[PDB]
Amino acid sequence: DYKSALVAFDNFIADFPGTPLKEDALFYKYDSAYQLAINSVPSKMEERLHVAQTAYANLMKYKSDTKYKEKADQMNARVETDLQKFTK
Amino acid sequence: QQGTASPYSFYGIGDIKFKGTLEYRSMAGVAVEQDSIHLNIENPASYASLMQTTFTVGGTFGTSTLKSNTGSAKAQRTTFDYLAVGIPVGKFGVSFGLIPLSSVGYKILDDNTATEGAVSSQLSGKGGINKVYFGVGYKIKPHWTIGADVQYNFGKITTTSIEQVTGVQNGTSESNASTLSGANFDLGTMYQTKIYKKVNLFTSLSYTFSSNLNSENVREINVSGDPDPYAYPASTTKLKLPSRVIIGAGIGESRKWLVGTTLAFQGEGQLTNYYNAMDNVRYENYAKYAIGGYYIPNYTSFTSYLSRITYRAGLKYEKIGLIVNNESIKDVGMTLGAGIPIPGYFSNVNIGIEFGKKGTVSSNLVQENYVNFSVGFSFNDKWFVKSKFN
Amino acid sequence: YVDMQFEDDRQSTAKNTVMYSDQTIKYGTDFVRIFKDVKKLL
Amino acid sequence: KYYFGNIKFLGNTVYSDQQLNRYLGIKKGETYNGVLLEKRIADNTKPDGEDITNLYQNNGYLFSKINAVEVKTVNDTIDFEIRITEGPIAYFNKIYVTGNDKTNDHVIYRELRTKPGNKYSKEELVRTIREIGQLGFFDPESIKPEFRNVDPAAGTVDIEYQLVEKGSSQVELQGGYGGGGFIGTLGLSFNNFSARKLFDKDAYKPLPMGDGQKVALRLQGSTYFQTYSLSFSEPWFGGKKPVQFSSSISYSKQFNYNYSSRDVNRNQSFNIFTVQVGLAKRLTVPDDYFVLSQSVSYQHYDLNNYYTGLFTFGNGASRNLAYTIGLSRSNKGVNPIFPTYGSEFSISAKVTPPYSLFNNINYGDLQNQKEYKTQYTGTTTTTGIDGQAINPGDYTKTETVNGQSGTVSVGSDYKSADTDVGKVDQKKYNWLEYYKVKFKADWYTKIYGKLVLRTLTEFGFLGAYDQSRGVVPFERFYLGGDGMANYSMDGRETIQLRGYPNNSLTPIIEDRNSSRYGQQIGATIYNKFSMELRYPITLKSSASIYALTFLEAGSSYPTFKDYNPFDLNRSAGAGLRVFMPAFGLLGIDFGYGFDALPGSTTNKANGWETHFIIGQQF
Ligand SMILES: CCCCCCCCCCCCCC(=O)O[C@H](CCCCCCCCCCC)CC(=O)O[C@@H]1[C@@H](NC(=O)C[C@@H](CCCCCCCCCCC)OC(=O)CCCCCCCCCCC)[C@H](OC[C@H]2O[C@H](OP(=O)(O)O)[C@H](NC(=O)C[C@H](O)CCCCCCCCCCC)[C@@H](OC(=O)C[C@H](O)CCCCCCCCCCC)[C@@H]2O)O[C@H](CO[C@]2(C(=O)O)C[C@@H](O[C@]3(C(=O)O)C[C@@H](O)[C@@H](O)[C@@H]([C@H](O)CO)O3)[C@@H](O[C@H]3O[C@H]([C@@H](O)CO)[C@@H](OP(=O)(O)O)[C@H](O[C@H]4O[C@H]([C@@H](O)CO[C@H]5O[C@H]([C@@H](O)CO)[C@@H](O)[C@H](O)[C@@H]5O)[C@@H](OP(=O)(O)O)[C@H](O)[C@@H]4O)[C@@H]3O)[C@@H]([C@H](O)CO)O2)[C@H]1OP(=O)(O)O
Ligand SMILES: CCCCCCCCCCCCCCCCCCCC(=O)O[C@H](COC(=O)CCCCCCCCCCCCCC)COP(=O)(O)OCCN
Ligand SMILES: CCCCCCCCCCCCCCCCCCCC(=O)O[C@H](COC(=O)CCCCCCCCCCCCCC)COP(=O)(O)OCCN
Ligand SMILES: *[C@@H](O)[C@@H](COC(=O)CCCCCCCCCCCCCCCCC)OC(=O)CCCCCCCCCCCCCCCCC
């Protein structure tokens, strides 16, 4: 239910500002968008790919030395690679 | 519970029951077009043309009047005709089902009562051969399909003859039971072109290989009152199912009209068992000539619903292949039908009426006039649809 | 709304159809429910 | 008198006037009926009515309001101007539940159909209430979804589920009528068990709570059988997908029952101890309508003077170890009681290990061995029926001297002794070896209006890997009558074929002089084809009543060599079915048999028959 996870996480990172769990929420928000984009209707695959990039940037901007950097970097590789198919 | 009442079912392996689904049976077996919602069980290549999963079931109510040089009699039979399932798998097509190859059935009574010392016979027969099939079709081209199938034949034919003299009260009842089992293979191809504007040329070729049938016979004689029956030693006979070549060709516009002809020929076979061996009955090659087609006034019509019904018709001339009393037994008949599509779905209800004459009254033979009413259900649904938006 | 009957969906647990009986009657008379209804009718 | 006329719609931007006119279904010249108009606009009696209001509210229009206004009234003709207030589309923003004091949130949030970020839909809210009530941990009358922070401008609505906990423990008191006899089940169930804290004795109030696991101790009984079982079920195995994991340990005592005369001989019975484990999960490929079921079971049969039919080892025991896998695809809807569309295809296969291949035992030559010949195990010289000595350890034979019959000593010539059928059958059936395949196809379609056509085709095959060993005497098929569910633990299946008595079509022993002639041994093959036309007279939640007409044909066979799939017993008739949540499913049917029962001398139709059942006896 990745579509509902994005909305739920967006509200959490807003209703509870300055929390120690923000780093985890940022990563899971990226994962939710990543899984939603890699497996989605080809009509709106570009829209979800862009959201994945935005979530990745927010995670890195928060804490550059995030614990999930290894996995996050791997996930961004797929998004960038798949984005080349829509480079009109 | 028998499927036929014709005395001719005694010879060979019985009367050929399956002759195609109601959609095709109403067109005299002409299945040249590559349909997308109907199953053409007689041609394995048609399985590739299916666009949605198909589930078919059919039944018929037959009415026949046996006529001879002595008198006439009326008989009626009700049976289940078929059960087939079609599944589209990419460019391939898979179909599996159960169909009746032949049926044996007759209830003849020779009443010789009212006279002391006269033997009365009560001849009866039941059973038949059934077939299980599994076929796969492939689209070598968008309008060219080829396919193959494997069919397993199995069934039991039992013949009973009870004789009782007028005086004595204890009669005898001889019964013969034969269990047949074998397998055969079928190959087919269907090609469709466009000769003129909106007019297409449909072609279909199918070939069935010869098969060997193993029959295990058991003959026992029982007498009323005696608790010990007289049983003959078990025997095993081999039968040979002849090969079939079906050629079809027709012209017409898809969803508008279609006119076609089909030619079916059978090779050499051995359908004579131990119980049906006679000297006045011989065998020849089966040959069928049929002409049929359909007409749809306006499939995409919103004003009248009668224009969306597929109207089918056909004519048929068949040479059964058996020569009784030096007279070739032939069957001639006409078929009419209509396919009503359920609104909102591709599924439809088929209705058909077939009438004809089989055999002749000459040479002391029996002529059969039949009027069969059949109903078929074709259900279509699209499966294997993946759901995106993970 | 609770009494409405619905078919299983993607969010409902899968039913095992290749197991023996669970000692339960499907769509059978529920005496506990009848008892609760009688109490409400008093 | 007043007649309707000039019905127009205003404010219908989403739906055209043509589409709405069809939904309303009111033509000019009809008699003025105020109730009919309101019923078609907004049917408040039921939440699933086919009204214009439900059309808007089920597609995100939360603020939709439809009100009829009488414009003109001239010449006894009234004119209406249906006004529709569509409003902006709304989406679910925040979904939270309150009132769960003993149930974890993950258990409740995973059963909510109102996912955040989706357009508002009344069907999802109603479905969510039904699912929350199915858990049983809350009050069925207090599942109130309250709308919060409604923002018409932003188009977002927050739903708060207020639940009232009422205890996870429950008592089961159910009853049913099938197979011509009543059946009742009694049991206690704890629907909120947690196996994680099993070893933790700190939290042991009425068994550890938490996860939505279910543990039940139920007792089911009938006239011929009684079963006690302990079952554990995990609705969400793994925590990621709704995978069901269930286990069960049961002990049943099945008496010998004659379905023909409804008489039970309490002196003959057998005990069955079964342990089963199963895993069922919905497949994502080929589609989301496929469900895979797997199961492993071990059973121990203990016969106690069970000398009936094909059971010659009435004092022995049998062990069964089988694996069952089943693929099913169901897309029926929407009401399980009265489906209007969809189909259900199921294929199952239960297989046992092929012991005959590895163990080097000849099951055909068992009757020609010393160990399987009748012998005198006593140690005192006796006299046989022939009046001769029977020394200890000598082989015996059965001889009929004068009227009475008895055993006669044959000496050491075991070749001339009588074969011990009990020992041969015991060795043949010490470990059940068989394979069972079941195929079922059900299709539902609407023919005209509310009338729907149902086509059902079922197949069943039971066989053995080695023909010399023979087909097992258990897991057989019984056809004819009202039918009964698979309540027995021995694999016996009762198939329903209206128009004929119960178990009237099962093959019988035809040996005549076998001392057991006429007994129903059971069928190994069965195939039933049915067609029905059903019309619903009431489909409300309180009571769902529908009428039906059927055309059935089915038959059972003893072996594959006698299988004639097109030689069936036909029947026809009509029936009525009523379903009430408290009283369950009630059905009355009247069928006519067009064929004679097996073993009948005269080939005459069976005739009319009456069938009454309570519950799903399939
Ligand atoms: C694919 C999907 C999955 C399915 C898988 C299945 C497919 C795999 C293959 C399976 C086949 C395996 C068979 C096998 O092998 O394993 C069998 C076990 C198989 C396990 C399978 C497990 C499956 C797992 C499934 C898991 C599922 C998850 C057992 C067996 O084996 O049983 C055999 C039995 N078959 C069955 O039971 C299968 C059953 C079927 C069961 C399975 C059903 C499964 C269906 C369920 C699926 C449904 C799914 C939905 O069928 C039936 O139920 C009916 C049909 C079924 C209908 C189905 C309908 C479907 C409906 C669906 C609707 C939706 C068989 O019948 C024959 C047929 O068998 C199968 O078909 P059928 O049965 O016909 O149907 C074949 N093949 C098949 O594929 C058919 C299949 O069904 C097809 C499957 C269909 C599937 C459908 C799928 C549907 C779903 C798909 C949907 C799309 C057929 O091929 C064919 O044509 C057919 C065809 O082409 C083949 C290919 C077809 C393939 C199909 C392709 C697929 C297509 C599908 C789609 C189209 C073939 O015709 O009889 C044999 C008896 O033979 C013996 C014996 O037992 O040893 C030896 C004999 O000798 C021979 C010989 O040696 O050659 C035999 C012949 O050759 C012949 O020439 C003969 C001469 O005539 C002789 O004159 O000689 C003879 O004895 C003689 O032999 C010696 C020799 O020397 C000769 O001289 C002598 O010795 P000596 O003198 O010393 O020299 C002896 O004498 C001495 O001994 C005597 C005594 O002293 C001794 O005492 C006692 O002991 C003796 C011992 O022998 C005993 O042990 C006894 O026998 C004595 O009688 C006596 O009582 C004295 O005698 P007396 O003088 O006093 O009298 C004498 O004095 C002296 O001492 C004696 O004389 C005889 C005796 O007479 C009997 O009494 O006995 C049995 O043993 P066998 O030998 O091993 O074969
Ligand atoms: C009878 C018991 C044995 C059953 C065995 C089950 C086999 C499992 C098959 C797993 C699915 C295949 C793996 C790949 C899935 C991805 C989709 C691509 C496969 C494919 O080309 O077929 C798609 C649909 O068929 C498919 O995905 C394959 C269809 C699989 C067979 C369907 C029938 C199963 C048995 C149930 C029938 C009996 C009723 C009992 C339930 C159509 O893909 P496309 O539309 O893109 O076309 C393709 C052209 N590019
Ligand atoms: C023949 C009976 C006697 C011998 C016993 C046979 C035993 C069969 C093998 C055991 C069954 C377990 C293995 C198959 C299920 C695993 C699939 C995982 C779940 C899943 O998501 O399914 C996807 C495909 O499913 C599939 O695998 C689709 C096909 C599943 C059905 C095929 C099994 C036979 C069905 C017919 C039974 C009746 C037989 C009648 C004669 C795989 O996805 P993923 O996990 O990679 O994730 C990627 C997306 N989620
Ligand atoms: C001769 O005595 C007479 C029998 O006399 C009786 O005792 C009367 C029998 C009872 C009559 C029926 C009582 C119940 C009323 C409802 C009937 C069912 C209608 C169902 C329609 C919708 C389907 C659910 O003999 C007769 O009456 C002869 C009967 C012959 C019937 C022939 C027509 C049957 C249809 C032929 C096709 C086979 C059916 C399957 C169709 C789908 C294919 C799979």
PDB file of C-alpha atoms and ligand atoms in Angstrom, chain B residues 57-61 76 78-80 375 377, chain D residues 531-533 549-551 572-574 592 594 608, ligand 4:
ATOM      1  CA  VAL B  57     -21.493 -26.744 -22.122  1.00  0.00           C
ATOM      2  CA  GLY B  58     -24.171 -28.202 -24.372  1.00  0.00           C
ATOM      3  CA  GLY B  59     -27.173 -30.495 -24.276  1.00  0.00           C
ATOM      4  CA  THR B  60     -29.746 -31.768 -26.734  1.00  0.00           C
ATOM      5  CA  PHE B  61     -33.252 -33.250 -26.816  1.00  0.00           C
ATOM      6  CA  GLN B  76     -36.876 -39.620 -27.765  1.00  0.00           C
ATOM      7  CA  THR B  78     -31.952 -36.429 -23.952  1.00  0.00           C
ATOM      8  CA  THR B  79     -28.206 -36.124 -23.429  1.00  0.00           C
ATOM      9  CA  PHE B  80     -25.293 -33.956 -22.341  1.00  0.00           C
ATOM     10  CA  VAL B 375     -29.019 -25.528 -26.425  1.00  0.00           C
ATOM     11  CA  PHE B 377     -23.841 -21.955 -23.376  1.00  0.00           C
TER      12      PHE B 377
ATOM     13  CA  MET D 531     -27.785 -25.558 -14.362  1.00  0.00           C
ATOM     14  CA  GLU D 532     -29.969 -23.172 -12.380  1.00  0.00           C
ATOM     15  CA  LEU D 533     -32.113 -20.081 -12.927  1.00  0.00           C
ATOM     16  CA  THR D 549     -35.117 -23.784 -10.865  1.00  0.00           C
ATOM     17  CA  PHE D 550     -32.629 -26.517 -11.704  1.00  0.00           C
ATOM     18  CA  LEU D 551     -31.666 -29.153 -14.270  1.00  0.00           C
ATOM     19  CA  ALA D 572     -35.313 -31.362 -12.505  1.00  0.00           C
ATOM     20  CA  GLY D 573     -37.289 -29.227 -10.098  1.00  0.00           C
ATOM     21  CA  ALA D 574     -37.494 -25.962  -8.197  1.00  0.00           C
ATOM     22  CA  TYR D 592     -38.056 -35.109  -9.867  1.00  0.00           C
ATOM     23  CA  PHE D 594     -36.110 -39.074 -14.419  1.00  0.00           C
ATOM     24  CA  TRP D 608     -40.627 -36.636  -6.900  1.00  0.00           C
TER      25      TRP D 608
HETATM   26  C1  LIG E   4     -42.837 -38.057 -19.145  1.00  0.00           C
HETATM   27  O1  LIG E   4     -43.484 -38.736 -18.100  1.00  0.00           O
HETATM   28  C2  LIG E   4     -42.374 -36.706 -18.639  1.00  0.00           C
HETATM   29  C3  LIG E   4     -42.043 -36.725 -17.156  1.00  0.00           C
HETATM   30  O2  LIG E   4     -43.228 -36.546 -16.378  1.00  0.00           O
HETATM   31  C4  LIG E   4     -43.132 -36.058 -15.138  1.00  0.00           C
HETATM   32  O3  LIG E   4     -43.303 -36.723 -14.148  1.00  0.00           O
HETATM   33  C5  LIG E   4     -42.776 -34.598 -15.133  1.00  0.00           C
HETATM   34  C6  LIG E   4     -41.359 -34.339 -14.645  1.00  0.00           C
HETATM   35  C7  LIG E   4     -41.226 -33.073 -13.814  1.00  0.00           C
HETATM   36  C8  LIG E   4     -41.253 -31.806 -14.656  1.00  0.00           C
HETATM   37  C9  LIG E   4     -40.387 -30.697 -14.077  1.00  0.00           C
HETATM   38  C10 LIG E   4     -40.830 -30.252 -12.689  1.00  0.00           C
HETATM   39  C11 LIG E   4     -40.163 -28.969 -12.197  1.00  0.00           C
HETATM   40  C12 LIG E   4     -40.498 -27.708 -12.992  1.00  0.00           C
HETATM   41  C13 LIG E   4     -39.273 -26.964 -13.508  1.00  0.00           C
HETATM   42  C14 LIG E   4     -38.537 -27.723 -14.604  1.00  0.00           C
HETATM   43  C15 LIG E   4     -37.089 -27.287 -14.770  1.00  0.00           C
HETATM   44  C16 LIG E   4     -36.906 -26.142 -15.755  1.00  0.00           C
HETATM   45  C17 LIG E   4     -35.481 -25.611 -15.750  1.00  0.00           C
HETATM   46  C18 LIG E   4     -35.202 -24.585 -16.838  1.00  0.00           C
HETATM   47  C19 LIG E   4     -34.036 -23.672 -16.489  1.00  0.00           C
HETATM   48  C20 LIG E   4     -32.740 -24.402 -16.179  1.00  0.00           C
HETATM   49  C21 LIG E   4     -32.376 -24.339 -14.705  1.00  0.00           C
HETATM   50  O4  LIG E   4     -41.217 -36.376 -19.408  1.00  0.00           O
HETATM   51  C22 LIG E   4     -40.880 -35.104 -19.603  1.00  0.00           C
HETATM   52  O5  LIG E   4     -41.401 -34.174 -19.044  1.00  0.00           O
HETATM   53  C23 LIG E   4     -39.770 -35.010 -20.607  1.00  0.00           C
HETATM   54  C24 LIG E   4     -38.729 -33.964 -20.260  1.00  0.00           C
HETATM   55  C25 LIG E   4     -37.854 -33.654 -21.463  1.00  0.00           C
HETATM   56  C26 LIG E   4     -37.052 -32.372 -21.302  1.00  0.00           C
HETATM   57  C27 LIG E   4     -36.313 -32.009 -22.581  1.00  0.00           C
HETATM   58  C28 LIG E   4     -35.702 -30.614 -22.560  1.00  0.00           C
HETATM   59  C29 LIG E   4     -34.504 -30.480 -21.627  1.00  0.00           C
HETATM   60  C30 LIG E   4     -33.446 -29.510 -22.134  1.00  0.00           C
HETATM   61  C31 LIG E   4     -32.495 -30.133 -23.147  1.00  0.00           C
HETATM   62  C32 LIG E   4     -31.052 -29.693 -22.953  1.00  0.00           C
HETATM   63  C33 LIG E   4     -30.379 -30.310 -21.735  1.00  0.00           C
HETATM   64  C34 LIG E   4     -30.297 -29.366 -20.542  1.00  0.00           C
HETATM   65  C35 LIG E   4     -28.932 -28.720 -20.365  1.00  0.00           C
HETATM   66  C36 LIG E   4     -28.774 -27.429 -21.152  1.00  0.00           C
HETATM   67  C37 LIG E   4     -27.393 -26.816 -20.998  1.00  0.00           C
HETATM   68  C38 LIG E   4     -26.314 -27.667 -21.643  1.00  0.00           C
HETATM   69  C39 LIG E   4     -25.190 -28.057 -20.699  1.00  0.00           C
END
